[PDB]
Amino acid sequence: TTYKNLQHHDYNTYTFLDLNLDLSKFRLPQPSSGRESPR
Amino acid sequence: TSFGSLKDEDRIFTNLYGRHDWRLKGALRRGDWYKTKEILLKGPDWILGEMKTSGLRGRGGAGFPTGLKWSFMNKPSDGRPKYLVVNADEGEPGTCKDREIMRHDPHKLVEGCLVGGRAMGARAAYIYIRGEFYNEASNLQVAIREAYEAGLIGKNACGSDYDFDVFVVRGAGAYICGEETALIESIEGKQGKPRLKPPFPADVGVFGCPTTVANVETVAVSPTICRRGGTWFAGFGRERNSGTKLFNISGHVNHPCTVEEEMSVPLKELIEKHAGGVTGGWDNLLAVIPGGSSTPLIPKSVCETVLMDFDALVQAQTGLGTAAVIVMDRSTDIVKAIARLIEFYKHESCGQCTPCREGVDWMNKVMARFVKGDARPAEIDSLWEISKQIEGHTICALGDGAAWPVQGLIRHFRPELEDRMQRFAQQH
Amino acid sequence: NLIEVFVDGQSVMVEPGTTVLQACEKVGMQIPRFCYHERLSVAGNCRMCLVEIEKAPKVVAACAMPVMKGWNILTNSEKSKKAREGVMEFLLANHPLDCPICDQGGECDLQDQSMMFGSDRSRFLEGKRAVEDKNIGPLVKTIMTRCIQCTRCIRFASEIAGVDDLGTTGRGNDMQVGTYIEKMFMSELSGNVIDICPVGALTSKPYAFTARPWETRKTESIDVMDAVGSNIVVSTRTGEVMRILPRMHEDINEEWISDKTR
Amino acid sequence: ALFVHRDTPENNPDTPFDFTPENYKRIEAIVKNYPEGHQAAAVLPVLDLAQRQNGWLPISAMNKVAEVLQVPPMRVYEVATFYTMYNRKPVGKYHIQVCTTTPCMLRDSDSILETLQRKLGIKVGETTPDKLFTLIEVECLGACVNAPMVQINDNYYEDLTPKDIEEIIDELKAGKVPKPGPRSGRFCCEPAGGLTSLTEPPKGPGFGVQ
Amino acid sequence: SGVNNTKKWKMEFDTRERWENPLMGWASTADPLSNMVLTFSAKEDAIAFAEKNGWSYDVEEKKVPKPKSKSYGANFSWNKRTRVSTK
Ligand SMILES: Cc1cc2nc3c(=O)[nH]c(=O)nc-3n(C[C@H](O)[C@H](O)[C@H](O)COP(=O)(O)O)c2cc1C
Numbered sequence A: 001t002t003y004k005n006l007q008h009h010d011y012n013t014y015t016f017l018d019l020n021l022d023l024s025k026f027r028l029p030q031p032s033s034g035r036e037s038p039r
Numbered sequence B: 001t002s003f004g005s006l007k008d009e010d011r012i013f014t015n016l017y018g019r020h021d022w023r024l025k026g027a028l029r030r031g032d033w034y035k036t037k038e039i040l041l042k043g044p045d046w047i048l049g050e051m052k053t054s055g056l057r058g059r060g061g062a063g064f065p066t067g068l069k070w071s072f073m074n075k076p077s078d079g080r081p082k083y084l085v086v087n088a089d090e091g092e093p094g095t096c097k098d099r100e101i102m103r104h105d106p107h108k109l110v111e112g113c114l115v116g117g118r119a120m121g122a123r124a125a126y127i128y129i130r131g132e133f134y135n136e137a138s139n140l141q142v143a144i145r146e147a148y149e150a151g152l153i154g155k156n157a158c159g160s161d162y163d164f165d166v167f168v169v170r171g172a173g174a175y176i177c178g179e180e181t182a183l184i185e186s187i188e189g190k191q192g193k194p195r196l197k198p199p200f201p202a203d204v205g206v207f208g209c210p211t212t213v214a215n216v217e218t219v220a221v222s223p224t225i226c227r228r229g230g231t232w233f234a235g236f237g238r239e240r241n242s243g244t245k246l247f248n249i250s251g252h253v254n255h256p257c258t259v260e261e262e263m264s265v266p267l268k269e270l271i272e273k274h275a276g277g278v279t280g281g282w283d284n285l286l287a288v289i290p291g292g293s294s295t296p297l298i299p300k301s302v303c304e305t306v307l308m309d310f311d312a313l314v315q316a317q318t319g320l321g322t323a324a325v326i327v328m329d330r331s332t333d334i335v336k337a338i339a340r341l342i343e344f345y346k347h348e349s350c351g352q353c354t355p356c357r358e359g360v361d362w363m364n365k366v367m368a369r370f371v372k373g374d375a376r377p378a379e380i381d382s383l384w385e386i387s388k389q390i391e392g393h394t395i396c397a398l399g400d401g402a403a404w405p406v407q408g409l410i411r412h413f414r415p416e417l418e419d420r421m422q423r424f425a426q427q428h
Numbered sequence C: 001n002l003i004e005v006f007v008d009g010q011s012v013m014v015e016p017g018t019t020v021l022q023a024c025e026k027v028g029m030q031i032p033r034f035c036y037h038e039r040l041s042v043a044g045n046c047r048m049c050l051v052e053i054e055k056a057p058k059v060v061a062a063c064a065m066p067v068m069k070g071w072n073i074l075t076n077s078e079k080s081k082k083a084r085e086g087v088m089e090f091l092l093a094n095h096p097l098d099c100p101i102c103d104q105g106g107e108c109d110l111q112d113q114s115m116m117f118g119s120d121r122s123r124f125l126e127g128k129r130a131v132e133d134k135n136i137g138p139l140v141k142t143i144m145t146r147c148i149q150c151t152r153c154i155r156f157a158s159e160i161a162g163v164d165d166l167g168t169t170g171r172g173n174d175m176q177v178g179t180y181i182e183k184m185f186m187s188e189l190s191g192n193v194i195d196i197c198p199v200g201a202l203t204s205k206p207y208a209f210t211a212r213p214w215e216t217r218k219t220e221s222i223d224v225m226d227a228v229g230s231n232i233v234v235s236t237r238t239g240e241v242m243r244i245l246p247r248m249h250e251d252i253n254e255e256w257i258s259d260k261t262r
Numbered sequence D: 001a002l003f004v005h006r007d008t009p010e011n012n013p014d015t016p017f018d019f020t021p022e023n024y025k026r027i028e029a030i031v032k033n034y035p036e037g038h039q040a041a042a043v044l045p046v047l048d049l050a051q052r053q054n055g056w057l058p059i060s061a062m063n064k065v066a067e068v069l070q071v072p073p074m075r076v077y078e079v080a081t082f083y084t085m086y087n088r089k090p091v092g093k094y095h096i097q098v099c100t101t102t103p104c105m106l107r108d109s110d111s112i113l114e115t116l117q118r119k120l121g122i123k124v125g126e127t128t129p130d131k132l133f134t135l136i137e138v139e140c141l142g143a144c145v146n147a148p149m150v151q152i153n154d155n156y157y158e159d160l161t162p163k164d165i166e167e168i169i170d171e172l173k174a175g176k177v178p179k180p181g182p183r184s185g186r187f188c189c190e191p192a193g194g195l196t197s198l199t200e201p202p203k204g205p206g207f208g209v210q
Numbered sequence E: 001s002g003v004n005n006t007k008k009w010k011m012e013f014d015t016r017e018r019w020e021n022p023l024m025g026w027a028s029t030a031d032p033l034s035n036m037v038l039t040f041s042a043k044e045d046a047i048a049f050a051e052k053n054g055w056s057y058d059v060e061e062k063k064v065p066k067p068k069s070k071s072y073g074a075n076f077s078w079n080k081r082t083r084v085s086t087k
């Protein structure tokens, strides 16, 4: 018939990160290693 | 049986050619997300038994039974959480399959990640892809946005009380990162450099937390297996080589292609049935690369009459890998081809193993000399001995990947090299 | 709690979380070494610690592998010796011919391991490589077309001196080891990478070009620069001091001493 | 190539660089994808981000990232030298790169590479004096079937010949944002002309179920 | 990193005057024994020889390394501090 996935030709160089920014509201709290960092 | 001759009703990765929609709607229509809740109820052990009954094997690299690979991790927890990782990376020359799977079937991939995490009592799935596939990562992130907003993912998975998370990651343009351990290290930020087995990611690994690795095709098919029965699936393949498979035919062909097919199928039938036929005439065919760069060639005498599966390729002295069937004819410098194939590794070897770092370049230089014949024969046996030195004395399979091609080239096509050398000597 | 092994028939009792190499040490047979130093972390870069494991085909690396009850180890066997031959052919593929100039001329672990466990010539009729040299301080003369890339300096720094400035920059033969800039790696403990780098890449500038080991009459003494008690080896030459070295005391200085005293 | 840093007047720690407030928003959102502790995974995408904010990655950017993530900066330098996409030397407007690996090669990446070199007048390993197009030859990219292909900034362009690439090149020298995809009739990956699979529609949700 | 030297037990003498010749600059000695290094396989036998020849012996006992547990996997840990930032 006709190719259908043509909804990215307009995807600029920030869309992935904007989407990450949006999803970070729907994510769940990450675990805590009970630490600041391993230095 | 004469395997192959498949039905597009059993062919799984529908929308392959993107002729349909790749959103949640078209997916539910195709048959995605069907009673996943009942599956989560049934729980892990049933899923693992289903996969074992199916007898499935792995796509990426050698065939390691997924049932056992995952039972390794099926276990209680000790505060240390458990993670899954998806090796969306695709750099192995001749492979254009996971990219399609993603830009045209992302919901099924998410479904498979969810099922696997449930099987392993996981918490989340990190999908690591390359950097060049920005469009694909974008489409996939959009599908995940839809999934979250619907409710098929997150705190309440699909109606149960299973808390699962999905995260996506891009690399930066490397290939080694497609290895079970340096993948993890790149994720953590450390250089894309592997580790030593033991220990194994199935007990120790990412963030010092147990985890499992999986290929996109395997994770995407496991749910269809679970919801169709497994035995039916296995019926489409030999005892050990069970299952369908994705193939990527490229090189000297009228119409290169990506295809879905059955396992243990004749290569000749595969090439001459799809692809519109081999270029210039079959007889012009010289040799093949049935597994990409990670496998050695085979000439006419076995390119014809052979099957296609891990076994019956091993017997043929080779492997399968990703099913990246390259084909050539009597019009190319096999030597130049393979020399570029090895310069690939000389450019994309991490470097921490001495034999890799200091033998891959040796090979590249000696093959660049072979190109023009400015050498003398016994360097042939020297190179063969170097390959046998490298094979097992490394960490990642890339050592074997760099040796095997040369081993095959020199077990098959020695007289070409000898004649090149005598001719160059003649020319002075 | 103990665990058993049968090396060359010979039996041994060890603990878990152990290593093939520590077992072979308990027995006496020394195993080769390029990326191992009991006072450091572990890696598998060099790939010269390989052995054979009876009843299992594939070789392993005795610096990382933990010993499993019932294994018969084989050190001086065919596959092992062949692995070592190949590995040293690889290393010496590019190690330039600066053995004379190299202040680490008579103490070169690599010299000795080639003379003993390696082979008798090179099958390398090809070209070599080189690399730029770095300024790293007025103490540590750096040649870097000799680094076999063992990472001893990297691990020693990132663990002991908490410096966190050294590291590897690149992949493939083009790899290097050293900061990405002209920074200075000066610290109270800078001055042991010399003793740790088996090769003469990170040499000492003062001692350099002054003498060689075998000429020396290594006497033994201690330090006074501090009140610690660092056992020391004082090297002489025709009735004069030429260099100072640490001396292994598992309590006080443990194979490490101070820039000042050395 | 080079894996070393000489402080030129354009590339020095005092070089101008800074992370915008919305970039900081994205930073926080990212780092909240990983655990408390082990918060270094931000490195790779953070550097890709700084690259997208300015095509090239300078010493100052590396140091800023390391100070943001509270990490030793050598663990940034290592990565920037390890991975390729991280441009450490300035880049022009279009970061063109062409596959030369065996399949693309034997399906003639050489002719198009030659025509591109002749067209832009410049050779691989450099760019125009106006600093517009930077050409490179590289290895596989996932288009090993639509073999003769390229990458430009983020998109591919496949199954193409010298005429096609010359057309695209003048089109890009004009201020155009072309449509990313093949340019030989084929749509995405199918066998040109006709098909043999997915011809019939799919079946229903409940099928072959236990 | 060699350990086929720390196997024996060696007898040496204290040092003595070691000056410079005025003519050219060589190093001379009044004592012949300075370069008399002797080997043994046991402290008891060495002591027997020493007290037999009548000298005044002083010992330096054995400095032996310790055993250690190199749980490599620990480098890639989660809660610990051993976690390295390199590879
Ligand atoms: C050097 C190397 C590169 C690899 N690259 C890829 C890749 O680009 N894409 C992919 O799908 N698998 C790749 N693999 C396959 C991996 O081995 C695989 O992701 C994993 O290790 C095994 O997973 P599996 O058992 O489910 O197949 C690569 C393997 C190796 C050794």
Ligand code: SF4
Binding pocket: B176, B193, B194, B348, B349, B350, B351, B352, B353, B354, B356, B357, B394, B395, B396, B397, B398, B399
């Ligand atoms: S074999 Fe080569 S690519 Fe693999 S880990 Fe070792 S050095 Fe890196």
Ligand code: SF4
Binding pocket: C095, C096, C097, C098, C099, C100, C102, C103, C104, C105, C106, C108, C109, C110, C111, C146, C198, C199, C200, C201
């Ligand atoms: S470290 Fe020095 S002595 Fe040893 S091989 Fe290299 S140059 Fe020769």
Ligand code: SF4
Binding pocket: C146, C147, C148, C149, C150, C151, C152, C153, C154, C177, C196, C197, C198, C199, C201, C202
């Ligand atoms: S400079 Fe010396 S210590 Fe550091 S990695 Fe190289 S060989 Fe090892």
Ligand code: FES
Binding pocket: C032, C033, C034, C035, C036, C043, C044, C045, C046, C047, C048, C049, C061, C062, C063, C064
């Ligand atoms: S000592 Fe084992 S690989 Fe270096």
Ligand code: FES
Binding pocket: B093, B094, B095, D099, D100, D101, D102, D103, D104, D105, D139, D140, D141, D142, D143, D144, D145, D147
């Ligand atoms: S053959 Fe060119 S992208 Fe793989």
